[PDB]
Design a binder for this molecule. Structure first.
Ligand SMILES: *[C@@H]1O[C@H](CO)[C@@H](O)[C@H](O)[C@H]1NC(C)=O
Ligand SMILES: *[C@@H]1O[C@H](CO)[C@@H](O)[C@H](O)[C@H]1NC(C)=O
Lengths: 483, 108
């Protein structure tokens, strides 16, 4: 009637924006849903999905074939699962009863309650493969139908964007972002411009600072042997202090993540239960009990290794692959000129005789409106993270709280004068504190045989402040402190 | 209905808190002006020369209020001052409370 023209214009804007954002963020959705389906039903015929989308994220060149492979395997699985529902399948002729053991050989230390797998129901040679013979056949197949739908909608979005490039002649925007005009130069103009810049290039600037936090999340929420392995690799990669020093080992870290998620799924798949053989850690002479066999991520029947623990490793792998891509493309000048130049700065500089060289403009006197935020985040945050270090050393009363209090007291006493020095010494002390924090995390993980939440937040704030110390915006505050 | 008297009361409150501690506010203001002068100089010149303010006012000592003798008027300073004075309500209250805190830290 009156508003249909403008309404349809807004609707076309919304449609093209949805198509653009889906073209930009499709791989994460499809891979996440595939991993979630793999975790839901743990049996075989889903192991290949995990191989594909665990060796396809870090190596993008395989992302083309690793999609069609899953597209074929999901329909093969659907056909098989439907074929397994006929009345002439008769699992009775298929089932196997595993004979009880005796007290002497291959005994379970809990003999009065053998209520576990292999003993509480006749095993099926196909249950270990995936066929389960469910009645509705719709709730049983939706996790594969939706996966096929996503795999098809991926290439649908691809070819729709291709056809939109054909008609209305345009080009593929090299500036893969949402606001194509907002760039580094437009950052320090207005608060809205800064918000747009961060919506554009958040992960570009804060990749490692987020991958490390994701690994710490994996460690803190998993809390087992593989968490100790992740801590070992985290300490090994952080030991290389410089940024460009870890851009060499990142592919190795991604390969490690892929191999470990593969091994963890191959552990969680168990052993074929049709042969009634059991695991070596459940015999007559054995020392492993339920708690230690749950801590160690070993295959078992009475206790099942929780498969949902793999979503954290998957998140870590996805972030690591994205960060690898960032490391790969951050050296190109075409993107370095627009929201680029992510290389660290020298550490022997000083605010004196240099305030006329840095490209960043002054903000201490707060001409604009966001300059108050800049001065509150670049100067009045050090004391906030010191307060956080104090808090995380009086909440969970343990032996490791001494280092937190000592570092807090030292920095709160000798803080004001340290900012006069070149950033070398303060960075050395902050690195020692990072090392103590990650060491406390690793030790609290090892001694589980607690519940680190404040230590992760402390680690995040310390990483934020460390990233702050190596910024050009800090030299203005150092000049003001000299004044 | 009552927002007018509410705003009048809060404005009188900020005026009170600024008045009872005017000495520290003026000292901080003149120190900020000297800091801006010195950082501009050190960005352009070579040496801080703590007595630069002395040899500067000597052209055109003990006076707690140097504000009537405006000797340094670089434009961005007045821009910042205007930005601070046009701040909305319930925020100048925060500025006054912070000034009271920094003024009476011993009592705090
Ligand atoms: C296996 O055990 C079940 C019940 O314990 C019984 O119904 C069946 O006849 C046994 N033999 C099989 C399934 O081969
Ligand atoms: C186990 O082995 C010993 C020696 O062979 C025997 O005395 C005993 O009867 C066997 N059975 C059990 C239940 O231990």
């Amino acid at each position: 009637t009156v508003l249909f023209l403008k309404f349809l214009e807004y609707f076309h804007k919304l449609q093209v924006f949805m198509w653009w954002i889906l073209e930009l963020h499709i791989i994460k959705i499809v891979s996440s849903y595939i991993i979630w389906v793999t975790v839901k039903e743990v049996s075989l015929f889903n192991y290949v999905f995990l191989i594909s989308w665990a060796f396809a994220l870090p190596y993008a060149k395989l992302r083309r074939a690793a999609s069609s492979v899953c597209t074929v395997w999901t329909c093969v699985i659907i056909v098989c699962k439907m074929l397994y529902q006929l009345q002439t399948i008769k699992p009775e002729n298929f089932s196997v009863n595993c004979s009880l053991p005796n007290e002497n050989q291959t005994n379970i230390p809990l003999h009065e309650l053998n209520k576990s797998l292999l003993y509480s129901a006749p095993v099926d040679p196909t249950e270990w493969v995936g066929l389960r013979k469910s009645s509705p056949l719709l709730v049983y197949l939706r996790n594969n139908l939706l996966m096929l739908a996503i795999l098809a909608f991926e290439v649908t979005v691809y070819r729709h964007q291709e056809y939109y490039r054909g008609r209305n002649n345009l080009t593929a925007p090299v500036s893969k972002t949402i606001f194509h005009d907002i760039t580094r130069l437009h950052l320090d103009d207005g608060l809205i411009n800064c918000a747009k810049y961060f919506v554009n290039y958040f992960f570009y600037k804060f990749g490692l600072e987020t991958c490390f936090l994701m690994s710490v999340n994996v460690i803190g929420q998993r809390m087992d042997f593989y968490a100790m392995i992740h801590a070992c690799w985290l300490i090994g990669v952080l030991y290389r202090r410089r940024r460009k020093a870890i851009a060499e080992v990142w592919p190795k870290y991604c390969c490690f993540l892929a191999c470990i998620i593969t091994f963890q799924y191959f552990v969680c798949i168990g052993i074929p239960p049709a042969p009634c053989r059991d695991y070596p850690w459940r015999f007559k002479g054995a020392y492993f009990n339920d708690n230690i066999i749950k801590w160690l991520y070993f295959p078992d029947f009475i206790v099942r290794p929780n498969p949902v623990f793999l979503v954290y490793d998957f998140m870590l792998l996805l972030c690591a692959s994205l960060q690898r891509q960032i490391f790969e493309d951050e050296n190109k000048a075409a993107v370095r000129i627009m929201a680029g130049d992510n290389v660290e700065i020298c550490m022997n500089l000083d605010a004196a005789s240099f305030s006329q060289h840095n490209p960043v403009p002054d903000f201490i006197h707060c001409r604009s409106y966001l300059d108050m935020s800049k001065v509150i985040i670049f100067s009045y945050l050090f004391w906030f993270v010191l307060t956080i270090i104090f808090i995380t050393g009086t909440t969970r009363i343990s032996i490791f709280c001494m280092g937190y209090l000592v570092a807090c007291f030292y920095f709160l006493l000798f803080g004001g004068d340290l900012l006069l020095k070149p950033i070398k010494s303060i960075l050395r002390y902050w690195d020692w504190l990072i090392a103590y924090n990650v060491f406390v995390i690793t030790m609290k993980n090892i001694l589980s045989i607690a519940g680190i939440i404040w230590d992760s937040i402390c680690f995040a704030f310390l990483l934020l402040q460390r990233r702050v110390f190596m910024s050009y915006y800090f030299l203005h505050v150092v000049a003001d402190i000299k004044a | 209905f009552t927002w007018v008297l509410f705003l009048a009361t809060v404005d009188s409150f900020t005026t009170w808190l600024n008045s009872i501690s005017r000495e520290h506010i003026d000292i901080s203001t003149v120190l900020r002006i000297e800091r801006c002068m010195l950082t501009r100089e050190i960005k352009k010149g070579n040496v801080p020369t703590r007595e630069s303010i002395h040899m500067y006012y000597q052209n055109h000592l003990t006076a707690s209020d140097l504000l009537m003798s405006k000797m340094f008027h670089d434009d961005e300073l007045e821009e910042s001052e205007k930005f601070y004075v046009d701040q909305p309500r319930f925020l100048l209250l925060f500025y006054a409370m912070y000034n009271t805190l920094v003024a009476r830290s011993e009592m705090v």
